Amino acid sequence: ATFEIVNRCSYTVWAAASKGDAALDAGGRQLNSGESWTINVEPGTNGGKIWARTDCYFDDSGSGICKTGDCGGLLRCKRFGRPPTTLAEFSLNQYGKDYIDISNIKGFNVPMNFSPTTRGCRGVRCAADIVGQCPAKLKAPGGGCNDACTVFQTSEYCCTTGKCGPTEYSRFFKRLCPDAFSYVLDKPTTVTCPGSSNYRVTFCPTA
Numbered sequence: 017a018t019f020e021i022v023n024r025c026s027y028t029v030w031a032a033a034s035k036g037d038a039a040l041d042a043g044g045r046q047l048n049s050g051e052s053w054t055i056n057v058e059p060g061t062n063g064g065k066i067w068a069r070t071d072c073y074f075d076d077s078g079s080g081i082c083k084t085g086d087c088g089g090l091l092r093c094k095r096f097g098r099p100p101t102t103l104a105e106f107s108l109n110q111y112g113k114d115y116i117d118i119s120n121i122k123g124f125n126v127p128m129n130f131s132p133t134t135r136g137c138r139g140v141r142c143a144a145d146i147v148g149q150c151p152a153k154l155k156a157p158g159g160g161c162n163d164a165c166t167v168f169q170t171s172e173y174c175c176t177t178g179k180c181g182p183t184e185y186s187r188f189f190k191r192l193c194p195d196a197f198s199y200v201l202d203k204p205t206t207v208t209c210p211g212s213s214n215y216r217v218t219f220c221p222t223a
Contacts, residue, residue, distance in 0.1 A: 017057045017108055018214040020133065021066060023047035025220035029068040029126060030082060032093040033057070040064055043092035046072075047219075059109045059212060066104040067097055068126040068219050070159055083158035084125040099123040100160035102142060102196075104130040104217045114209040118142050119197040120189040124150075125160035129221035137209035142193035143222045151188060163189070163199075175200035 021031045031047050033040035033055055041055035057064060069085035078091035085097035100123025106116045117140060118130050124146040131139025150161035164185035165174035172180050180201055182190070190198035195205050 017059060017212060019055050019057055019066065020216045021047065021053045021055065022216060022218045023049060023051055023068075023220070024218055025049060025126065027070070029070055029219055030072045030091065031066065032069055032085060032087055032097055033064065033066045034087065034093045034096055035061055035064045036096055037094070039092055039094045043094060044087070044090070057108065061106070061108045062110070064106050064108070065096060066217050067101040068128070069097060070125060084156070084160045099166045100125045100156050100162045102126055102128045104128060106215070109211045112211045114211055114213050115206050116140070116209060116215065117197060117204070117206045118193070118195065120146075120193060121163055121165075121197050121200060123154075123156070123161055123163040123166060124189065126219050127221060129218040131216050131218070132209055133214045133216050135210070137207050137213070140195045140205065140207055141221060142196040144192035146189065146192050149188075149192060151185065154185060173199075
């Protein structure tokens with residue numbers, strides 16, 4: 017499957033793509049404002065994620081630090097990034113179907129649109145100013161808006177027992193972005209697409 021990753025933000029982001037135990041394609045790349053990066057993701061990929069990282073510094077060796085979404089100090093991510101990270105999530109060719117979603121379960125750092133470039137399903141988007149509106153206790157100094165599980169580490173926020181309800185904090189994410197997961201047991205906003213669809217992830221889709 018082909019993913020075009022487009023940075024429409026006015027600032028540089030460092031895109032990342034991983035399935036948790038391995039990079040997807042190169043795993044990461046600098047994207048200046050306006051730049052697009054096309055990656056190939058192998059069919060059948062389960063649990064892939066794409067996200068943006070902000071305010072990164074890397075050296076010759078691709079080692080460094082990002083203020084949001086850092087994946088163990090590497091330019092080319094092999095693991096998932098440190099919250100807060102708006103997440104484009106996907107599982108491809110699962111019994112003839114692709115499944116895509118945007119999740120705020122790990123917080124929010126950059127607005128995002130996640131859309132197919134082929135026929136047969138809708139895209140999803142979380143483009144509200146969640147950082148600007150972020151509740152005081154969830155604001156991350158590095159930038160972005162943490163989820164409540166990351167901040168407070170309780171069974172209720174992290175849904176550790178498999179039973180949990182919405183919270184004041186999850187409802188904030190849900191109010192601004194109804195089409196993204198706001199907590200683990202949120203009513204699914206997953207979109208079902210034809211197997212082997214192609215996609216575009218756009219950072220800052222509106223502004």
